[PDB]
Ligand binder design. Structure first.
Ligand SMILES: [Zn+2]
Lengths: 109, 243, 56, 48, 282, 97, 227, 93, 49, 227
RNA sequence: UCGA
């Protein structure tokens, strides 16, 4: 019943290469919207939340994307493998597909 | 045809450890012993703890003490050699080995002194005992002093060695290896053939296609599904082009 | 005709080799990294060499 | 139940002749198999 | 090679002056890597005996055969007084030489503790992040060549005595036997019925398996930290904990093909050898 | 098999001495259920542990030290074997050859 | 100091060498390179070429002969022969064994510039009335070249065999401490040379040392450059 | 990796845009037998050869350094395809 | 395609008992299955090969 | 067949030499000997113990100087000199500086034919009124000799110092299999060598190779002990 | 049916 924090790897998978939906005020360092995220950013959010400054994390997600027959960069994130903002004309459907596809062999346990 | 074992061929033991031949090393360079007899394989100790097979280890130890003796070893399944037995075999073979160098006008090698000293740090050989007894213990553990056939210097620590049984597996690179530039095509659809003796190219799976798209190589994919495979004038005009 | 691979060929294919590179795939193809691309380097043998790290 | 002999070595044909398959005409088929089908029964022991 | 070698032989005695401790080092009353005390500030015999003004000096002194590849010594190395192991300095060095400058290189790496899987990973990320693609690639390849040849020099191998079952096995396991005698004498006393006896037994073998596993790892750390199997699976080279348990330890109870787990302990490890029974159940 | 489920069957690894039972507690089972027994209830035994495996699997020395997976692999690989001109039988074998 | 050098041979077969004293750690640097080139670049024979009036190929079993052809070949590369001349590149040998008499390297037809180092080498156990004619070209070269990488072409069937030249059986060097010099912990290097008799241990060490010093002083005028 | 990559990717927004660029330019280099290019003798991507050391025939590498300088120009709807392609096959054979 | 061969292991003549092996097999070493060889083996990470 | 030798060097610091190509296995054959002989030989700076006014122990801090005693010792080790005349195998350099002075390897008061090839080195910093005098002992020879081995004490309070001999820092040759035409068996062997400025990399190399052909020519006279 |  004690509310804890999602352990490192979780949020690392959650907020990495994200795009800020709205402005953020915590710990004196202001995070404007549209700014992408890195390990520095994410760990900073970690610490900030550890200070009880912030809990919710508004971000633009593929679900929230109104791009039709596709998606956008602001709704997506980095390119992961390239660590840089996702390039236009990207395979993201297939990306996703393979990304969760390879693990298919290793959950027997 | 006489087929000598080539580079890349499948080989494995009775204890279930596979592999392929990687770059056979010249007789010159090789981790030999004070008798100057180099080893024949030098297999990496990784697949052992992950795949959990100790039988090859014990087999190699019995082969260690046994090579010196040459006598055979019948170890029926679940009933056979045990740690004390093989231990005595080790002590035996070593007694006669240290004997081999003692009467032939030799003694403890300085490099061996070094290896024994470094091993004495982690308690690998019981301290307070002379290097002779220490090499008795070490050799008993399954490992002895090896010298890099390249540098000539020993190795930081002991290396388990011995006689062990292996096998030359059916799959042979001289067979499995195949390639084709431009061959025949299927009658129904102009798609190239497959198989080896049929002289045909590999197929690009659905998942292959997907991955190719994931990279975002549009042309590579297009050429793959068209020019490179069955395309009407595509393959022909291709051969034309590169020619 | 005639396996006469004498230096006329062995070193010309070389002149075409440099620059453009080829691809290698290990089935199953799961991650896209299951298909990568490498600079061709001709080596004596019937086997295939590849960088130990990407093998994973 | 009838196929190319295993001549890869003597022990090959030996073992092969000593192998048993639940597949074929009037056994089960690939499409139908469970856990208990390919499993090892308690009393298996010195038999298979 | 990045491992910090430390010995318990010296016992860490109390010396008012360095010279006393030195004489003691010669006489064998202390170990080279042993954390002894000098004046009011403790230190290793090596940190005193071996003092280097720069990496290349230490490289010569070591590779010449006067010092082991891993010991506690003192060096400057980019303008600071630090006490570490030759393989550490080597690490930072190779990083720098691979990337082209050792400043930022050494800056983002741990200069204290041995480098295993995850640490390396972090460094790779920091590399492709702060540096760029080609740089990171050349870096990785340097790790390939250097690393491979390092493990080659090591000659770390695997043998029967390279994993030894802790002495705690006999004790704790036969204790579990006595406990089983308790539970069994209960089952006929009416205190415990059948099912709950099965449960008490199942948790008995649970906690037994854990006691002996803990014993395995603790024994490998307290005594033989350079143990090849241990080190191997530890640094993330090859292995997992359960593997090490079954290989040296108690393999633990098995599961019936029906899915209800067995009530009978397998005990003996892979090296101990398993009886026909255990092997079949497994 | 049906008849095997009936009696109490010991193991080949039983405490064999002087053609008699040595230690009180002895390996045994019914239907495949491991149970410790006594010098009395002893009924049947095993000829040899060899019967608990196949041909190739029995050609592996110290097999009790190898996990089932790699053992399996070892066996079917013994099937995958090819002839050798200079071939040399294992200097350590199970004596079954 | 003075590098006292004592050179022990025994026959053309087994011999060792000891040099003491020497600088600390040098013994490695001496011992290994020697051994390295000592096991490789040393010329030898182990034949190449073989012909028999009775055979199709390397297989077909010759009547009156226990072992098949390729087994008689198992006995070929294990045969060591030295020439009494340095200048004889190639050669030829003739062999005849009739009746129920066995075959060995000594059973050959002796000639000029040829000596066998193992007449006791077993070839084939010839049964009752086995008649066989044989001939072999034993040439000399460097290193080891398999039969598949070199051709012959004598007559109706000319079948190559592996060439293991490398007359040195094996080389083992050991670095010990010597009392023979001014300071402490010096290197007395003992190089153990095992030869088959095509070359005595002494002269083996000689030629090895030759290629050694030569390829050593191979560093000539270089070409410098700077960024 | 391929020399001068990070900057290349650093130019075009789309990771793929670069590919289009490289492709088209390199193909154009193969069209005219390398007399188009903005690379001078010192910048000529010479390949090492035992026979004799010549310019690397591969169009890709050439394109690499070609953009690496930045002497080129890349953009969508740059000029009508007509006069664009007509004056390219004119200047050079 | 695996070769089948039988090597006579008996001399020109001698007297043998019943069951004694007069000839080998595709892999048979003196009445024992010979798959591979027992050759010297070392264990260590050699140049990562 | 034609072992081309190329050496690309920069300054008295770095040099890299390749013999391309070389026979298989030979490329690894010359690597370690040249390695150890380069680092275990080839004499140089070799700076031993130095007496220091007011400084007794190697520990007790020195007033008027920023760095403590040991730091200065490090700075001393780093320095490199050379004897112009082979006659002088031993010298004692001295320095005395007071007040707020910048103390460097240049400030060092000169000597006989001894020359300092390292003009700028930061030895120490002197605060206001800081008094310092030291006389350092310098010699020749090879390898490495820690404060344990040499018991050097010139004056009463002089403190033994680790001596840097061999001009080279590290070598650790990099050999690789190369290809020219056919036959992948070639060797590309390359060397990365460092120098402290005493001898240019090429010099150190050639000196080593001299040591090499010398010790190689140690084999002439046999002594026959055959058992 | 057997490799991976
Ligand atoms: Zn969007």
């Amino acid at each position: 019943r004690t509310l804890r924090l999602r352990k490192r790897s979780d949020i690392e998978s959650g907020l990495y290469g994200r795009v800020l939906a709205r402005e953020v005020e915590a710990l004196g360092r202001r995070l404007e919207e549209g700014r992408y995220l890195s390990l520095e950013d994410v760990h900073f959010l970690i610490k900030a939340a550890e200070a009880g400054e912030v809990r919710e994390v508004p971000v633009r997600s593929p679900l929230t994307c109104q791009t039709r027959y596709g998606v956008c960069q602001k709704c997506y994130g980095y390119d992961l493998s390239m660590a840089r903002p996702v390039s236009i004309g990207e395979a993201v459907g297939v990306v996703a597909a393979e990304s969760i596809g390879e693990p298919g062999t290793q959950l027997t346990m | 045809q006489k087929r000598k074992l080539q580079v890349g061929d499948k080989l494995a033991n009775r204890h279930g450890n596979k592999g392929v031949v990687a770059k056979i090393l010249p007789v010159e360079d090789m981790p030999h012993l004070p008798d100057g007899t180099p080893v024949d394989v030098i297999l990496n100790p990784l697949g052992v703890p992950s795949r959990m097979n100790l039988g090859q280890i014990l087999e190699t130890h019995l082969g260690l003490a046994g090579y010196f003796l040459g006598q055979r070893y019948i170890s029926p399944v679940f009933d056979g050699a045990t740690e004390p037995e093989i231990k005595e075999l080790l002590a035996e073979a070593f007694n006669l080995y240290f004997g081999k160098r003692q009467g032939e006008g030799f003694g403890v090698d300085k490099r061996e002194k070094e290896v024994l000293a470094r091993a004495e740090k982690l308690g690998l050989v019981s301290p307070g005992k002379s290097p002779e007894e220490q090499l008795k213990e070490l050799f008993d553990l399954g490992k002895v002093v090896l010298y890099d056939g390249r540098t000539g210097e020993p190795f930081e620590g002991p290396i388990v060695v011995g006689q062990m049984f292996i096998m030359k597996l059916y799959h042979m690179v001289e067979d499995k290896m195949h390639a084709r530039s431009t061959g025949p095509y299927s009658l129904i659809t102009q798609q190239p053939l497959g198989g080896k003796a049929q002289f045909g190219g590999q197929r690009f799976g659905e998942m292959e296609v997907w991955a190719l798209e994931a990279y975002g190589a549009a042309h590579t994919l297009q050429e793959m599904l068209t020019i490179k495979s069955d395309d009407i004038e595509g393959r022909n005009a291709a051969y034309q082009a590169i020619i | 005709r005639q396996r006469d691979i004498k230096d006329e060929v062995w070193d010309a294919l070389e002149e075409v080799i440099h620059g453009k590179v080829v691809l290698l795939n290990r089935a199953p193809t799961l991650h896209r990294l299951g298909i990568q691309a490498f600079q061709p380097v001709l080596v004596e043998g019937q086997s295939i060499q590849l960088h130990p790290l990407v093998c994973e | 139940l009838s196929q190319f002999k295993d001549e890869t070595n003597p022990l090959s044909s030996l073992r092969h002749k000593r192998r048993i398959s639940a597949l074929g005409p009037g056994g089960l088929t690939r499409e139908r198999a469970g856990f208990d089908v390919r499993d090892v029964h308690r009393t298996h022991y010195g038999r298979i | 090679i990045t491992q910090v070698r430390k010995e318990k032989k010296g016992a860490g005695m109390a010396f008012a002056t360095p010279e006393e401790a030195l004489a003691a080092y010669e006489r064998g009353e202390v170990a080279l890597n042993a954390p002894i005390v000098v004046a009011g500030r403790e230190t290793s015999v090596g940190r005193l005996k071996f003092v280097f003004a720069n990496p290349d000096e230490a490289l010569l002194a070591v590779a010449h055969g006067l010092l082991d590849l891993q010991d506690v010594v003192t060096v400057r190395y980019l303008g600071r007084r630090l006490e570490t192991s030759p393989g550490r300095i080597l690490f930072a060095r190779i990083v720098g030489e691979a990337v082209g400058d050792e400043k930022v290189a050494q800056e983002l790496i741990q200069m204290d503790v041995p480098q295993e899987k995850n640490s390396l990973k972090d460094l790779v990320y920091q590399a492709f992040l702060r540096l760029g693609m080609e740089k990171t690639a050349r870096l990785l390849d340097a790790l390939k060549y250097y690393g491979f040849t390092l493990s080659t020099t090591s000659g770390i191998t695997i043998g029967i005595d390279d994993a030894v079952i802790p002495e705690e096995k006999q004790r704790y396991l036969e204790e579990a036997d006595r406990k089983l005698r308790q539970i069994e004498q209960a089952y006929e006393m009416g205190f415990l019925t059948d099912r709950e006896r099965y449960d008490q037994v199942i948790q008995l073998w649970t906690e037994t398996t854990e006691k002996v596993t803990q014993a395995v790892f603790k024994n490998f750390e307290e005594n033989y930290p350079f143990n090849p199997l241990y080190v191997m699976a530890q640094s993330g080279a090859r292995g997992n904990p359960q593997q090490i348990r079954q290989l040296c330890g108690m393999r633990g109870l098995m599961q019936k093909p029906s899915g209800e787990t067995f009530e009978v302990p397998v005990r003996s490890s892979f090296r101990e050898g398993l009886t026909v029974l255990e092997y079949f159940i497994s | 098999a049906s008849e095997e489920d009936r009696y109490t069957i010991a193991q080949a690894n039983t405490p064999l001495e002087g053609d008699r039972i040595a230690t009180d507690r002895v390996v045994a089972r019914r239907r495949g259920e491991p149970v410790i027994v006594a010098p009395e209830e002893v009924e049947f035994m095993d000829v040899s542990p060899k019967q608990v495996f196949s041909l190739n699997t029995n050609l592996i020395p110290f097999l009790e030290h190898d996990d089932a997976n790699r053992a399996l692999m070892g066996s079917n690989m013994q099937t995958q074997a090819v002839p050798l001109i200079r071939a040399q039988a294992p200097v350590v074998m199970t004596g079954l050859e | 100091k003075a590098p006292v050098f004592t050179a022990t041979t025994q026959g053309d077969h087994y011999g060792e060498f000891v040099l003491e004293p020497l600088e600390r750690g040098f013994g490695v640097t001496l011992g290994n390179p020697l051994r390295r080139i000592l096991l490789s670049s040393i010329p030898g024979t182990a034949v190449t070429s073989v012909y028999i009036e009775d055979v199709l190929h390397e297989f077909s079993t010759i009547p009156g002969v226990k072992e098949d052809v390729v087994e008689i070949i198992l006995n070929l590369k294990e045969l060591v022969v030295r020439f009494l001349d340095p200048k004889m590149a190639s050669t030829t040998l003739i062999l005849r064994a009739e009746g129920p008499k066995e075959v060995r390297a000594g059973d050959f037809t002796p000639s000029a510039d040829v000596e066998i180092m193992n007449p006791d080498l077993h070839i084939a156990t010839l049964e009752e009335g086995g008649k066989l004619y044989m001939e072999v070209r034993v040439d000399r070269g460097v290193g080891y070249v398999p039969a598949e990488r070199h051709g012959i072409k004598d007559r109706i069937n000319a079948i190559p065999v592996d060439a293991i030249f490398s007359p040195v059986r094996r080389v083992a060097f050991q670095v010990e401490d010597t009392r023979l010099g001014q300071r402490t912990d010096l290197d007395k290097l003992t190089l153990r040379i095992w030869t088959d008799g095509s070359v005595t241990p002494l002269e083996a060490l000689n030629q090895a040392v030759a290629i050694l010093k030569e390829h050593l002083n191979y560093f000539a005028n270089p070409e410098a450059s700077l960024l | 990796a391929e020399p001068g990559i990070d900057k290349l990717f650093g130019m075009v927004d789309s990771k793929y845009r670069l590919t289009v660029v490289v492709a088209k330019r390199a193909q154009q280099l193969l069209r005219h037998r390398f007399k188009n290019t903005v690379l001078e003798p010192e910048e000529r991507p010479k390949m090492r050869t035992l026979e004799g050391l010549y310019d690397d025939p591969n169009a890709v590498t050439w394109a690499m350094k070609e953009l690496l300088t930045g002497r080129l120009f890349f953009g969508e709807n740059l000029v009508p395809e007509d006069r664009l392609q007509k004056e390219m096959e004119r200047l050079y054979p | 395609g695996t070769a089948f061969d039988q090597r006579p292991r008996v001399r020109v003549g001698q007297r043998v008992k019943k069951g004694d092996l007069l000839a080998d097999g595709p892999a048979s070493e003196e009445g024992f299955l010979a798959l591979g060889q027992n050759v010297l083996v070392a264990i260590m990470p050699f140049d990562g090969y």
